Amino acid sequence: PTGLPTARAAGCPFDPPPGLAALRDRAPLTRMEFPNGHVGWLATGHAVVRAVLADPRFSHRNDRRHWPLADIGFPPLPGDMLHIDPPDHTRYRKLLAGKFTMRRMRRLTGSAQEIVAGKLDAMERHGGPLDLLEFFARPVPTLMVCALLGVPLQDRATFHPPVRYVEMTYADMQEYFRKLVAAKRAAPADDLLSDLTTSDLTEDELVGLCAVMMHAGVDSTSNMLALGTWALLERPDQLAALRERPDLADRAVEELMRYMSVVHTGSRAALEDVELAGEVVRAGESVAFSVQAANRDPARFADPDTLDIRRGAVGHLGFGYGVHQCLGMQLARVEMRVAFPALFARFPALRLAVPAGDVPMRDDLVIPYGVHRLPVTW
């Protein structure tokens, strides 16, 4: 019956569409008509979203689910583990999870510090005003994925717009990574891609995984760096707390993840009848889920609509949950824990360079949410 509430409020860039809260607080699982007319369900409560995301009976194949944000489904491509179901998905997870632990990703902390440092240096040389996305929020996570995969230093510039060029397609990236995989097979190094050349993945699977990673590790991270910097610079009291207690970086990253919920909406399809929140979701029905509503659920978080880095903690669903929990979440944490405090240590008076209403927001249906540019000065 209901449609998905998607309209953001004009003075409130960080908060969810107003209609979600009253829906969630009344019926955290409810019937929903999708943009294409499919009648499925909408999960907005934190517990019900977790139950959807943890249950392997829920498919993420694009030829099984209906998309909740557009009125529009093909089988998954090699390497696109987010849209592959068990048991193939389980093969990717068993191979990759142990390579993506915090203990392994913390070994890239120095790389993250130096990537961050280099982009801060180029910002100061240019001077304000400038676009934080072009100078910092997009190149930092791009160079981080390049470091993770061991992309040659002299090739990395092909993967992001020049800081002041052809934007690579998926096919362009597959061609590049086919060559790089062959090179690492012949001459291994201490990096993830070299390590994976000894696995059972086919060339097509490994090349697809790399091309996916260059988007999966970049788009959301970039928009988190932009939105999180904007939110922090409006809260000088929280910046003071982070300056005085730099150990608060870890909590601040979790609280920003919860508050921003940039991967705001998704869906899954039932592979068989599933009891969910007192209802039977029948085989073939899609359940849309709202990460952003779940991350503001008062059933789960005190004062959910207040941003307070001092109480930041794991438990939010900003990296997903369960079957397809974000593989890169520990790397994302390492890079954001470096980046947010470093930006304000170098530019303590960082602030917007335009009226807040002039910041160009992404359209309400785009995922991830974020901004197209973030003009800043200092």
Ligand code: HEM
């Ligand atoms: C702050 C930055 C990031 C956010 C907000 C984010 C968010 C997410 C979310 C919400 C999902 C699950 C989507 C769903 O359930 O439909 C996911 C999956 C995934 N992410 Fe991330 N991610 C980020 C960074 C990264 C990075 C840095 C990498 C790689 C280096 C990465 C790789 C992946 C992969 C491979 C999956 C699929 C995992 C699976 O299917 O088992 N992510 N991410």
